[PDB]
Amino acid sequence: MRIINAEGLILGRLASKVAKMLLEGEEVVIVNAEKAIITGNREDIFAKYKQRTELRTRTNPRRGPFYPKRSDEIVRRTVRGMLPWKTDRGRKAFKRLKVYVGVPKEFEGKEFETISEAHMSRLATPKYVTVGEVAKFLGGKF
Amino acid sequence: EVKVFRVKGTFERLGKKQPFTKEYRALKEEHVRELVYSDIGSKHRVPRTKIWIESIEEIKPEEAEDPVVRRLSL
Amino acid sequence: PVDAWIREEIEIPEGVEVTVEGNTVKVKGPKGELQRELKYPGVQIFTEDGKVVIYKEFPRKKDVAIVRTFKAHINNMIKGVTEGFKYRLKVVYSHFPMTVKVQGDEVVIENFLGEKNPRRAKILPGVTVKVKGSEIEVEGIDKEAVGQTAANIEQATRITKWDRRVFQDGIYIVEKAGKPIKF
Amino acid sequence: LRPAKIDRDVDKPAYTRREYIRGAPGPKITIFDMGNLSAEFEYEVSLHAEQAMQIRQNALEAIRIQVNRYLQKNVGRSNYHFKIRVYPFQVLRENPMNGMRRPFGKPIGLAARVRKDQKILTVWVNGQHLKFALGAMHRAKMKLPYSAYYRIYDKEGNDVTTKVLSTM
Amino acid sequence: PAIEVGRIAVVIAGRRAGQKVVVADIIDKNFVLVTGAGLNKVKRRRMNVKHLEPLPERVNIQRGASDEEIKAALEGAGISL
RNA sequence: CUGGGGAUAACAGAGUCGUCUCGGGCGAGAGCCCAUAUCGACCCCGAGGCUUGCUACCUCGCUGUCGGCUCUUCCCAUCCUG
RNA sequence: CGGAGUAGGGGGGCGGUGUAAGCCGUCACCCGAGAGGGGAACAACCCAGACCGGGGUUAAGGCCCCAAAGUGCCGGCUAAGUGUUACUCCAAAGGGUGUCCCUGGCCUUAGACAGCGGCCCGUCGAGGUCAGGGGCCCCGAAAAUGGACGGGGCUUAAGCCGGCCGCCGAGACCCCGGCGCACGGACCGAUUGGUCC
RNA sequence: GCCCGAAAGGGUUGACCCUCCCCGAAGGAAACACGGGCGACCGUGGAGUACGAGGGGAGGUGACCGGGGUUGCACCGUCCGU
C-alpha cells in the first residue's frame, strides 16, 4: 500500500487523486488527517458542516444521512463522494482505503509521500481552516 | 534595449465612447497591443473590435507620468 | 498596483536589539523582552544596516495598509522596552462610596451603587495596578496588555438599566498613554 | 389607486382620439409654466429619460407642487422659470367585471408617453441658484416610474454640465 | 533567490527546457530579458519569470548589457553556462 | 331514469397576483423652537403565496364536505421567558 | 376515371385584447405522424433526418473525480463559497473612501493633515485635492418533512472578463462488402411474370 | 464462470488456437535532428513510413466448435392496449 501524509494539503485535490488511485487498483493509507486544510471563511465552512450534521430523517433516525463529526471520517466521506458508491466497483475501491489521525506505531518508521498537485504553497490568500478546527466545532473526538 | 511606448485610442461601452491614453515598457509594439486589449477588456468588459488604437509611439523615460513605469525606468 | 516596491525602514536605537527568526520579531531592551508574529504573503522583514526593513514588491491598497501597520507595531515594541507605557483612570461617585482593592490578579470594587456583590476585573501578566486615592495607575511594558487591563477595569462598572444622565458613577479612562481625553 | 407598473410600459397602441373614445376623463394638471416667464436666464437644467416611460398626471402634479414650493422658498419667483414640457394625451383603460366576458377597458386616467433621451421638465436659473435647481431635479427624479438623468445646457444649446459641476 | 539584474537562472519551460541564462534587464512585473552570451544556443529574448528558476550563483553587470560584456564578466567570475 | 362527458362549473391541486398580509425610497408637514424620539402625507419600488378573485392545465362515480374532539410535527414576520 | 382519410390541434416567432395567467388570429420551421447524440432528467431548445455488417473522421458541446478527453497557456478581476444557469426553471427602486480603471479642473519646493503661538513664519518636505463616468462585489434580501451549483468539492480556482493551443465525442460525412426499390434494356417464358446488365 | 451435449449442424480428407509472408480502401503515428513562439505548442525532415477493414497463400498442433440452460461484471433501458 501507498502511504500519504496529509500535512499542508488541500482536501478536495487530495481526494480526487486518491480516488483515481483507488479505482486504478491500489491500496491507500492516509495519516495525519487532522492537519489538512480547508479554504474559505470560518463562518461559511462551519455553517455548512453544521447544517449537514443536523440533517436527518423525520420518521426514523436509524436511517438518515449519517454525516460525520470526526476528521478521518470527514476525509473518508469526501473521497467517497468522489466514487461510484452505488456500484460493486465503487464499494471495493472504497474498501481499499484507510484513514488515520496521527501516525500509528504500525506505520511509524516508514517513508511517506506527498501529492504535488495539492499543497498550501499554491495559495495566495491567508484564508484557510483546518479539519481539526472543524471537528472541535462540531463536537468530535480528536 | 527596452523602450517606452505611449498608446492613445478610444473604447466603447453600452453605446458610449471614451478616450484613453496609457504607457508601457516593452521591446516591440505588438506586445503593447495585446496587453492593451487584455487589460481594457478585463476592466471594462469590452471586446477587441470596440477598441480603436489610433496612436502607438515611442518616448523617453522622463516624458512619462505613470508611477510604475517611471519608477521601473528611473 | 499603486507603486512598484514599497519599503519602509525603522531606525534602531542604542540599547535595543531587534532580531527576526522565522516570521517572529524579537526585541530586547533595557527592560524585558517582547516577541510577536507578523505574517503576510509577500511581506519580508530583515535588518540591513542597523534598521528594520519591511518590503513588498508590487502592492495593492490592502498591502500598503498592512505594511504601515507592522511598522506601527514594531515602533510600539521598541518604545515600550525603552520607556514603558502608563495609563490613568479616575473614580467618581455621588452616593455609595466604593472601595477598590488589588489582590493577586484581580481588582475588586465593593459597594458600587450599594450592591452586595463585588465586581472583579482581571489583570494580565506583566502589568501592575496601583491605587492612590481616587486615581488609579496601570503601568506596563506591552501596549495591548496595559490597554486591555485598563479597559477591563473600566468595563467592570457598566450600567444598562437606568438613565446614564443621572447615574454616572463608575471608573473611567482619562489618559491613554499620555494623550488626554476631551469632549 | 392601482400601481404604476401596470401603466409604465409602451408596448401598446396609442389611444388618443376623444371624438371616438366615449367617457374620456379630464386632466388634473392644468398649469405647466411657473415663475418669470419673460426672462433671459443663463443656465438651463433639464431631465432626460433613460428609457421609454409612460407617466401619469398624478405624478406630474406631485412633481409640480413639490418642486415649485421648494423653489419658491429657496430661490424666489423672479429668479427661476419652471416648465413641464409634456401633456397627457394617452387614455388609460381598466376592465370592469362577469369575468373576462366582454373585456375592453373603460377609461380611468391619462398619461404622457415619453421616449428615450426625451426632456420632461426644465428649470431656467441664474448661476447662483444651481444647487437649488439640482435639488429640485433630485426631488423630481425620485417620483418617476423609471430612471432619469439631467444635463445643463447653455444658451446656444450646448452641454456644459461637466464644466459647471466641476466648479460649484 | 530572487530575480534581479545579473542573476543566473535556469529554464523549466519550452524548447530550451533545462539550460542556463543571465538575466540582463527587467521589463515589467512579469517579463525579463534573457541571453546566454555565446556559451550556448539561447539567444536574446524575453521570458516570463514563471518560466525560470533562479540560483545562488550571480555575476555583476550593468542594466542593459551585451553578450561580449556578459561573456567577459563570466570568464572573470568563473560561472559555466 | 338512460347514454355519456374533466371538450364544462361548485370542491382541494397547478398557474397568476389585481385584491390581500408584511415591507421599503424621497422628505412635505406636525411635533414650545427641532425633517428623522415618534409620526411620515402626495408620488415612486417590492417580498410572500396564510384572504379573495381571474383562467380552465389534472380528476365527473378514487375521495366530494364545514366545525369540534383526539394525536404528531414545522416556519418566523417574537406574545411571555434570556 | 376511381378509392379514401381529415371539420377538438399544439411548441416557437409576429399582431389585437387582458393586472397577468390566458383568449382570439396569423406565419408554415418543428411535435403530432420523427429514431439517434447533448441540455441532470424534459413532446416540440441545440446538433441532426434512420435498410444490414464492419472500419475511420467530425457536429452540438465538453476535458479535477463521478465520466471519455487539459489539475491546459498568457494577461487582468472577485473574497462575497458571489459564482460554478444558452433557454427551459434565476428579484427592484434606492445606495456604498469595498476594490480595479478612464476623464477634466484647481494646488505644489512647500503644497493637503499636526503641532507651537498670534492670514502668517519655521517645523516633519512630496505628491495632493475636487468633481463626473465605467467593471466586479456588498447592503436593500423573511417560510413552512431533512438539502440541493446534477453531486463531491473548488479561492494567483475546478469562478468572471479578453484571447489562444491541443485532445474527446453521433446512426451525421468518407470507405469497404451485402439486401431491396424505382427507371431503362436484352434474353426467356402454357397467363399477372423470371435471369442478367 | 459452472452444467448438458448420441442423432438431425461442421469437423481427423483435420476444430480451436499459434506463428510467417504478399496485396491493402478511407485514414494514419512516434522517437529523433534543425530552427519559430514569454508559453501550451507549432513548421521542415523522418513519412504517406510503422500500421490499417478485408482478400489470398504457406506451414506447425492435434480435438473440439457452433448451439442450449443458468448466473457474475460493465454500459444502456419508467410495462401492454385505448
mmCIF file of N, CA, C and O in Angstrom, chain E residues 8-76:
data_model
loop_
_atom_site.group_PDB
_atom_site.id
_atom_site.type_symbol
_atom_site.label_atom_id
_atom_site.label_comp_id
_atom_site.label_asym_id
_atom_site.label_seq_id
_atom_site.Cartn_x
_atom_site.Cartn_y
_atom_site.Cartn_z
ATOM 1 N N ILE E 8 21.810 34.610 -12.386
ATOM 2 C CA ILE E 8 21.936 33.408 -13.194
ATOM 3 C C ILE E 8 20.759 32.504 -12.868
ATOM 4 O O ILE E 8 20.448 32.272 -11.694
ATOM 5 N N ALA E 9 20.101 32.000 -13.903
ATOM 6 C CA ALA E 9 18.818 31.347 -13.756
ATOM 7 C C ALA E 9 18.769 30.137 -14.676
ATOM 8 O O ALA E 9 19.598 29.978 -15.573
ATOM 9 N N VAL E 10 17.779 29.287 -14.448
ATOM 10 C CA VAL E 10 17.592 28.071 -15.218
ATOM 11 C C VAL E 10 16.248 28.146 -15.922
ATOM 12 O O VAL E 10 15.348 28.879 -15.500
ATOM 13 N N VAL E 11 16.110 27.381 -17.001
ATOM 14 C CA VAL E 11 14.869 27.340 -17.769
ATOM 15 C C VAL E 11 14.133 26.039 -17.488
ATOM 16 O O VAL E 11 14.737 24.960 -17.454
ATOM 17 N N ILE E 12 12.816 26.142 -17.303
ATOM 18 C CA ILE E 12 11.971 24.997 -16.993
ATOM 19 C C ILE E 12 10.837 24.823 -17.987
ATOM 20 O O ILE E 12 10.062 23.875 -17.860
ATOM 21 N N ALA E 13 10.711 25.705 -18.971
ATOM 22 C CA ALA E 13 9.576 25.705 -19.878
ATOM 23 C C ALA E 13 10.046 25.960 -21.295
ATOM 24 O O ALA E 13 10.804 26.902 -21.540
ATOM 25 N N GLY E 14 9.587 25.136 -22.215
ATOM 26 C CA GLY E 14 9.761 25.390 -23.617
ATOM 27 C C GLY E 14 10.702 24.425 -24.303
ATOM 28 O O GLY E 14 10.924 23.294 -23.869
ATOM 29 N N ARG E 15 11.238 24.893 -25.426
ATOM 30 C CA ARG E 15 12.178 24.107 -26.210
ATOM 31 C C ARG E 15 13.510 23.989 -25.486
ATOM 32 O O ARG E 15 14.157 22.937 -25.519
ATOM 33 N N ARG E 16 13.927 25.068 -24.834
ATOM 34 C CA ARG E 16 15.146 25.124 -24.048
ATOM 35 C C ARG E 16 14.902 24.677 -22.615
ATOM 36 O O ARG E 16 15.395 25.305 -21.674
ATOM 37 N N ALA E 17 14.174 23.582 -22.433
ATOM 38 C CA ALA E 17 13.781 23.125 -21.102
ATOM 39 C C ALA E 17 14.995 22.530 -20.408
ATOM 40 O O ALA E 17 15.334 21.356 -20.575
ATOM 41 N N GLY E 18 15.653 23.362 -19.612
ATOM 42 C CA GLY E 18 16.840 22.998 -18.873
ATOM 43 C C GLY E 18 18.075 23.529 -19.554
ATOM 44 O O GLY E 18 18.687 22.845 -20.373
ATOM 45 N N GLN E 19 18.481 24.727 -19.155
ATOM 46 C CA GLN E 19 19.573 25.477 -19.752
ATOM 47 C C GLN E 19 19.716 26.747 -18.929
ATOM 48 O O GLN E 19 18.747 27.226 -18.329
ATOM 49 N N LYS E 20 20.927 27.288 -18.908
ATOM 50 C CA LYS E 20 21.281 28.380 -18.014
ATOM 51 C C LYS E 20 21.255 29.714 -18.745
ATOM 52 O O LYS E 20 21.467 29.788 -19.958
ATOM 53 N N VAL E 21 20.996 30.775 -17.986
ATOM 54 C CA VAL E 21 20.701 32.080 -18.550
ATOM 55 C C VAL E 21 21.188 33.163 -17.601
ATOM 56 O O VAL E 21 21.208 32.978 -16.384
ATOM 57 N N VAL E 22 21.577 34.302 -18.170
ATOM 58 C CA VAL E 22 21.925 35.502 -17.417
ATOM 59 C C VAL E 22 20.842 36.540 -17.666
ATOM 60 O O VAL E 22 20.576 36.902 -18.818
ATOM 61 N N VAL E 23 20.229 37.031 -16.593
ATOM 62 C CA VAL E 23 19.130 37.982 -16.694
ATOM 63 C C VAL E 23 19.718 39.380 -16.817
ATOM 64 O O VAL E 23 20.486 39.818 -15.958
ATOM 65 N N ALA E 24 19.347 40.089 -17.882
ATOM 66 C CA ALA E 24 20.014 41.321 -18.261
ATOM 67 C C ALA E 24 19.165 42.574 -18.127
ATOM 68 O O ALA E 24 19.718 43.676 -18.212
ATOM 69 N N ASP E 25 17.856 42.456 -17.930
ATOM 70 C CA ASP E 25 17.020 43.641 -17.803
ATOM 71 C C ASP E 25 15.621 43.228 -17.381
ATOM 72 O O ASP E 25 15.177 42.109 -17.637
ATOM 73 N N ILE E 26 14.927 44.172 -16.760
ATOM 74 C CA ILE E 26 13.648 43.942 -16.107
ATOM 75 C C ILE E 26 12.601 44.769 -16.839
ATOM 76 O O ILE E 26 12.562 45.995 -16.686
ATOM 77 N N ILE E 27 11.757 44.116 -17.643
ATOM 78 C CA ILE E 27 10.833 44.854 -18.485
ATOM 79 C C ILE E 27 9.600 45.286 -17.705
ATOM 80 O O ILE E 27 9.050 46.366 -17.936
ATOM 81 N N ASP E 28 9.140 44.457 -16.779
ATOM 82 C CA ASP E 28 7.830 44.637 -16.174
ATOM 83 C C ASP E 28 7.780 43.811 -14.896
ATOM 84 O O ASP E 28 8.812 43.360 -14.389
ATOM 85 N N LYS E 29 6.575 43.628 -14.365
ATOM 86 C CA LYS E 29 6.346 42.723 -13.252
ATOM 87 C C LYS E 29 6.307 41.267 -13.679
ATOM 88 O O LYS E 29 6.245 40.385 -12.816
ATOM 89 N N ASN E 30 6.341 40.994 -14.975
ATOM 90 C CA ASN E 30 6.181 39.641 -15.480
ATOM 91 C C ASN E 30 7.254 39.207 -16.459
ATOM 92 O O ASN E 30 7.439 37.998 -16.629
ATOM 93 N N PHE E 31 7.975 40.126 -17.086
ATOM 94 C CA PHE E 31 8.893 39.795 -18.158
ATOM 95 C C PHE E 31 10.305 40.290 -17.858
ATOM 96 O O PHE E 31 10.509 41.404 -17.356
ATOM 97 N N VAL E 32 11.279 39.443 -18.186
ATOM 98 C CA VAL E 32 12.690 39.770 -18.071
ATOM 99 C C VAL E 32 13.341 39.510 -19.419
ATOM 100 O O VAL E 32 12.813 38.784 -20.260
ATOM 101 N N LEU E 33 14.481 40.151 -19.630
ATOM 102 C CA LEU E 33 15.281 39.992 -20.834
ATOM 103 C C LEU E 33 16.441 39.048 -20.548
ATOM 104 O O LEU E 33 17.291 39.341 -19.703
ATOM 105 N N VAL E 34 16.472 37.924 -21.252
ATOM 106 C CA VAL E 34 17.474 36.890 -21.046
ATOM 107 C C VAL E 34 18.398 36.832 -22.249
ATOM 108 O O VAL E 34 18.004 37.183 -23.368
ATOM 109 N N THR E 35 19.614 36.343 -21.993
ATOM 110 C CA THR E 35 20.574 35.900 -23.034
ATOM 111 C C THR E 35 21.599 34.976 -22.373
ATOM 112 O O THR E 35 22.032 35.298 -21.254
ATOM 113 N N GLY E 36 21.985 33.890 -23.047
ATOM 114 C CA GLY E 36 23.271 33.234 -22.744
ATOM 115 C C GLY E 36 24.290 33.540 -23.825
ATOM 116 O O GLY E 36 24.060 33.140 -24.977
ATOM 117 N N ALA E 37 25.378 34.230 -23.465
ATOM 118 C CA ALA E 37 26.083 35.116 -24.422
ATOM 119 C C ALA E 37 27.109 34.320 -25.237
ATOM 120 O O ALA E 37 28.312 34.626 -25.127
ATOM 121 N N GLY E 38 26.640 33.368 -26.052
ATOM 122 C CA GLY E 38 27.503 32.565 -26.942
ATOM 123 C C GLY E 38 28.137 31.377 -26.235
ATOM 124 O O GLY E 38 28.895 30.645 -26.898
ATOM 125 N N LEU E 39 27.832 31.174 -24.949
ATOM 126 C CA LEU E 39 28.327 29.984 -24.205
ATOM 127 C C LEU E 39 27.347 28.827 -24.425
ATOM 128 O O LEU E 39 27.611 27.722 -23.919
ATOM 129 N N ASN E 40 26.259 29.101 -25.152
ATOM 130 C CA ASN E 40 25.255 28.111 -25.518
ATOM 131 C C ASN E 40 24.356 28.646 -26.623
ATOM 132 O O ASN E 40 24.608 29.701 -27.212
ATOM 133 N N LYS E 41 23.281 27.899 -26.884
ATOM 134 C CA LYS E 41 22.422 28.183 -28.028
ATOM 135 C C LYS E 41 21.536 29.396 -27.781
ATOM 136 O O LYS E 41 21.317 30.207 -28.686
ATOM 137 N N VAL E 42 21.018 29.527 -26.562
ATOM 138 C CA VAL E 42 19.990 30.502 -26.215
ATOM 139 C C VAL E 42 20.347 31.878 -26.753
ATOM 140 O O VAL E 42 21.490 32.328 -26.632
ATOM 141 N N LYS E 43 19.375 32.547 -27.361
ATOM 142 C CA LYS E 43 19.546 33.872 -27.921
ATOM 143 C C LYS E 43 19.058 34.935 -26.938
ATOM 144 O O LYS E 43 18.768 34.656 -25.775
ATOM 145 N N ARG E 44 18.971 36.172 -27.414
ATOM 146 C CA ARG E 44 18.488 37.295 -26.621
ATOM 147 C C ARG E 44 16.986 37.440 -26.815
ATOM 148 O O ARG E 44 16.525 37.764 -27.913
ATOM 149 N N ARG E 45 16.224 37.229 -25.744
ATOM 150 C CA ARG E 45 14.771 37.222 -25.840
ATOM 151 C C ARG E 45 14.159 37.707 -24.538
ATOM 152 O O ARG E 45 14.860 38.076 -23.598
ATOM 153 N N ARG E 46 12.831 37.732 -24.500
ATOM 154 C CA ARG E 46 12.082 37.956 -23.276
ATOM 155 C C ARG E 46 11.554 36.639 -22.743
ATOM 156 O O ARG E 46 11.369 35.672 -23.479
ATOM 157 N N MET E 47 11.335 36.614 -21.438
ATOM 158 C CA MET E 47 10.856 35.416 -20.773
ATOM 159 C C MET E 47 10.008 35.794 -19.571
ATOM 160 O O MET E 47 10.296 36.769 -18.872
ATOM 161 N N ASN E 48 8.961 35.009 -19.345
ATOM 162 C CA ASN E 48 8.131 35.141 -18.161
ATOM 163 C C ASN E 48 8.856 34.570 -16.951
ATOM 164 O O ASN E 48 9.390 33.460 -17.005
ATOM 165 N N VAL E 49 8.867 35.332 -15.855
ATOM 166 C CA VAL E 49 9.591 34.915 -14.664
ATOM 167 C C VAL E 49 9.059 33.601 -14.121
ATOM 168 O O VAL E 49 9.773 32.897 -13.400
ATOM 169 N N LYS E 50 7.808 33.261 -14.436
ATOM 170 C CA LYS E 50 7.278 31.950 -14.095
ATOM 171 C C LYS E 50 8.154 30.843 -14.653
ATOM 172 O O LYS E 50 8.363 29.815 -14.002
ATOM 173 N N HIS E 51 8.666 31.033 -15.867
ATOM 174 C CA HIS E 51 9.374 30.002 -16.609
ATOM 175 C C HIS E 51 10.874 30.017 -16.364
ATOM 176 O O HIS E 51 11.650 29.670 -17.259
ATOM 177 N N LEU E 52 11.300 30.417 -15.173
ATOM 178 C CA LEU E 52 12.705 30.488 -14.823
ATOM 179 C C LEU E 52 12.863 30.072 -13.373
ATOM 180 O O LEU E 52 11.964 30.269 -12.553
ATOM 181 N N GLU E 53 14.012 29.491 -13.064
ATOM 182 C CA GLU E 53 14.361 29.131 -11.692
ATOM 183 C C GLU E 53 15.686 29.780 -11.333
ATOM 184 O O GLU E 53 16.737 29.348 -11.841
ATOM 185 N N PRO E 54 15.705 30.807 -10.488
ATOM 186 C CA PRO E 54 16.975 31.436 -10.123
ATOM 187 C C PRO E 54 17.872 30.487 -9.350
ATOM 188 O O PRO E 54 17.517 29.352 -9.031
ATOM 189 N N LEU E 55 19.064 30.979 -9.044
ATOM 190 C CA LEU E 55 20.111 30.191 -8.417
ATOM 191 C C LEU E 55 20.882 31.059 -7.442
ATOM 192 O O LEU E 55 20.820 32.292 -7.509
ATOM 193 N N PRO E 56 21.621 30.443 -6.520
ATOM 194 C CA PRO E 56 22.577 31.216 -5.712
ATOM 195 C C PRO E 56 23.593 31.966 -6.551
ATOM 196 O O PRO E 56 23.904 33.124 -6.258
ATOM 197 N N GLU E 57 24.101 31.339 -7.607
ATOM 198 C CA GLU E 57 25.098 31.966 -8.461
ATOM 199 C C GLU E 57 24.601 33.315 -8.977
ATOM 200 O O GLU E 57 23.408 33.622 -8.948
ATOM 201 N N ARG E 58 25.543 34.124 -9.452
ATOM 202 C CA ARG E 58 25.270 35.503 -9.829
ATOM 203 C C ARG E 58 26.566 36.160 -10.278
ATOM 204 O O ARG E 58 27.641 35.848 -9.760
ATOM 205 N N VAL E 59 26.451 37.076 -11.239
ATOM 206 C CA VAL E 59 27.552 37.939 -11.642
ATOM 207 C C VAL E 59 27.051 39.376 -11.643
ATOM 208 O O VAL E 59 25.855 39.642 -11.538
ATOM 209 N N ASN E 60 27.994 40.304 -11.751
ATOM 210 C CA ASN E 60 27.702 41.729 -11.740
ATOM 211 C C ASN E 60 27.845 42.288 -13.143
ATOM 212 O O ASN E 60 28.844 42.034 -13.824
ATOM 213 N N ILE E 61 26.847 43.052 -13.562
ATOM 214 C CA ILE E 61 26.798 43.672 -14.871
ATOM 215 C C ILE E 61 26.087 45.013 -14.730
ATOM 216 O O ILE E 61 25.700 45.422 -13.633
ATOM 217 N N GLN E 62 25.935 45.713 -15.844
ATOM 218 C CA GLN E 62 25.197 46.964 -15.868
ATOM 219 C C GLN E 62 23.831 46.752 -16.519
ATOM 220 O O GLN E 62 23.659 45.898 -17.392
ATOM 221 N N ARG E 63 22.853 47.540 -16.075
ATOM 222 C CA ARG E 63 21.478 47.393 -16.526
ATOM 223 C C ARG E 63 21.346 47.723 -18.004
ATOM 224 O O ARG E 63 21.516 48.875 -18.413
ATOM 225 N N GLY E 64 21.050 46.708 -18.808
ATOM 226 C CA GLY E 64 21.090 46.834 -20.244
ATOM 227 C C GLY E 64 22.495 46.492 -20.673
ATOM 228 O O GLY E 64 23.402 47.323 -20.557
ATOM 229 N N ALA E 65 22.695 45.279 -21.173
ATOM 230 C CA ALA E 65 24.034 44.752 -21.348
ATOM 231 C C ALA E 65 24.115 44.010 -22.667
ATOM 232 O O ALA E 65 23.113 43.794 -23.352
ATOM 233 N N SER E 66 25.333 43.614 -23.011
ATOM 234 C CA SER E 66 25.628 42.976 -24.278
ATOM 235 C C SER E 66 26.318 41.642 -24.030
ATOM 236 O O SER E 66 26.781 41.341 -22.925
ATOM 237 N N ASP E 67 26.380 40.836 -25.086
ATOM 238 C CA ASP E 67 26.814 39.457 -24.917
ATOM 239 C C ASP E 67 28.316 39.378 -24.717
ATOM 240 O O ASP E 67 28.796 38.564 -23.925
ATOM 241 N N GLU E 68 29.077 40.234 -25.400
ATOM 242 C CA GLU E 68 30.512 40.294 -25.146
ATOM 243 C C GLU E 68 30.804 40.666 -23.696
ATOM 244 O O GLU E 68 31.663 40.054 -23.051
ATOM 245 N N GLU E 69 30.091 41.659 -23.162
ATOM 246 C CA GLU E 69 30.329 42.088 -21.789
ATOM 247 C C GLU E 69 29.966 40.988 -20.808
ATOM 248 O O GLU E 69 30.685 40.746 -19.827
ATOM 249 N N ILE E 70 28.841 40.325 -21.051
ATOM 250 C CA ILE E 70 28.424 39.227 -20.194
ATOM 251 C C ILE E 70 29.446 38.103 -20.237
ATOM 252 O O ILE E 70 29.787 37.518 -19.206
ATOM 253 N N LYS E 71 29.969 37.801 -21.426
ATOM 254 C CA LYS E 71 30.951 36.737 -21.576
ATOM 255 C C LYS E 71 32.227 37.070 -20.829
ATOM 256 O O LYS E 71 32.825 36.205 -20.182
ATOM 257 N N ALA E 72 32.660 38.323 -20.929
ATOM 258 C CA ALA E 72 33.839 38.778 -20.209
ATOM 259 C C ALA E 72 33.667 38.612 -18.705
ATOM 260 O O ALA E 72 34.516 38.015 -18.029
ATOM 261 N N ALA E 73 32.584 39.163 -18.161
ATOM 262 C CA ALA E 73 32.330 39.035 -16.732
ATOM 263 C C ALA E 73 32.187 37.576 -16.310
ATOM 264 O O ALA E 73 32.601 37.205 -15.209
ATOM 265 N N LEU E 74 31.629 36.725 -17.175
ATOM 266 C CA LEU E 74 31.509 35.307 -16.849
ATOM 267 C C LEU E 74 32.874 34.642 -16.767
ATOM 268 O O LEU E 74 33.158 33.897 -15.824
ATOM 269 N N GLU E 75 33.708 34.849 -17.786
ATOM 270 C CA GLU E 75 35.078 34.350 -17.738
ATOM 271 C C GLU E 75 35.764 34.789 -16.456
ATOM 272 O O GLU E 75 36.422 33.986 -15.785
ATOM 273 N N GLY E 76 35.607 36.062 -16.095
ATOM 274 C CA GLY E 76 36.224 36.556 -14.875
ATOM 275 C C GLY E 76 35.678 35.901 -13.619
ATOM 276 O O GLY E 76 36.426 35.617 -12.680
#
